[PDB]
Design a protein around this ligand. Structure first.
Ligand SMILES: Cc1nc2ccc(-c3cc(N)nc(N)c3)nc2n1CCOc1cccc(Br)n1
Length: 333
């Protein structure tokens, strides 16, 4: 009975149904094992939640949100991982999902972190915006709260079809329970500033993830919250004063002057690290490795950049929503 991780034995069979094959990943929530479902005759990934009350309760919200989504007749709900079923077993909550392939970070690593074609970036972007559109569904209104290349899995290794996983920081509009959510690199300024958030935080993460997908480098690689916020300001400049005026953690990064304006405390100047230059819009793409190449015209790069900057709006209110993002000229065929 010792420790909070399930004692998974390789090859052992549960409820005379699931044959554990191997541990395929760990984390904070617990572990994921590959197992054969002799009853449905298929390979399943079982998320085994730590026998710990905090992770049990959080998992229980994951299950509800997954059972909410996977009952909607939409076809947009095929961008979200399928929850086959869940059960209590050896005092651990087990969520049973479809087996998927590797994540968009493993994909980046496959390319020696040079990033993928703008053409493949677009395919990922359209899929993710449609998932986000699906999550913004009134009867759902789910916020993933932890989008990153790691939580975006491929269905097969050959195809570019993606699904989102890990609804373990996930919540619905009005049911916000953590002040500190998201992965730092993909954490929206409102969350950094400690403000109440909505689904607009997932569109922020998406923007960062998309630029990373094509440059193979995190857009904002902050060591801590002060480094994180500073890196964002480097590119996007000082946030709207109207936002920092309500921002609980405003004074963790900025200072108000007598003038009533904000600036930084004791890096490149605000907004002087142009995304345009990060992307190598006019100098043959990231590291110059897309120079002359098809689908990588200055024009193509401009449309992507414009959509990225609509995703990275400091203002959660004016920041672009999945429906409008799909109607963007980056997607038109
Ligand atoms: C191979 C594979 N198929 C999966 C299907 C679903 C899930 C899955 C995993 C989690 N934490 N939460 C949900 N709701 C679904 N994880 C799968 N994995 C493992 C390789 O990806 C990942 C992704 C995230 C974390 C880890 Br460890 N590993």
């Amino acid at each position: 009975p010792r420790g909070s991780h399930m004692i998974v034995k390789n090859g052992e069979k549960w409820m005379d149904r699931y044959e554990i094959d191997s541990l395929i990943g760990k984390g904070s929530f617990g572990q994921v094992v590959k197992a054969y479902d002799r009853v449905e005759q298929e390979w399943v990934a079982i998320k085994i939640i730590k026998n710990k009350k905090a992770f049990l309760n959080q998992a229980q919200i994951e299950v509800r949100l997954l059972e909410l989504m996977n009952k909607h007749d939409t076809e947009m709900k095929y961008y979200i991982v399928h929850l086959k079923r869940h059960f209590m077993f050896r005092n651990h909550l087990c969520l049973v999902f479809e087996m998927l392939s590797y994540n968009l970070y493993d994909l980046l690593r496959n390319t020696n972190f040079r990033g993928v074609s703008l053409n493949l970036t677009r395919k990922f972007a359209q899929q993710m915006c449609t998932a986000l559109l699906f999550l913004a569904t009134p009867e759902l209104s789910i916020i993933h709260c932890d989008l990153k290349p790691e939580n975006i899995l491929l269905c097969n290794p050959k195809r570019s079809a993606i699904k989102i996983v890990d609804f373990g920081s996930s919540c619905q509009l009005g049911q916000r329970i953590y002040q500190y959510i998201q992965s730092r690199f993909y954490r929206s300024p409102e969350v950094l500033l400690g403000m109440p958030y909505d689904l607009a935080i997932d569109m922020w993460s998406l923007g960062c993830i998309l630029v990373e997908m094509h440059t193979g480098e995190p857009l904002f690689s902050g060591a801590n919250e002060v480094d994180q916020m500073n890196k964002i300001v480097e590119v996007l400049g000082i946030p709207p004063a109207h936002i920092l005026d309500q921002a609980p953690k405003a004074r963790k990064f900025f200072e108000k002057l007598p003038d009533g304006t904000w600036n930084l405390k004791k890096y490149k100047p605000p907004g002087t690290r142009k995304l345009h230059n990060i992307l190598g819009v006019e100098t043959g793409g990231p590291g110059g490795r897309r120079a002359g190449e098809s689908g990588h015209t200055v024009a193509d790069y401009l449309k992507f950049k414009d959509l990225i900057l609509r995703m990275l709006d400091y203002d959660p209110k004016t920041r672009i929503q999945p429906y409008y993002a799909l109607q963007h000229s980056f997607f038109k065929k």
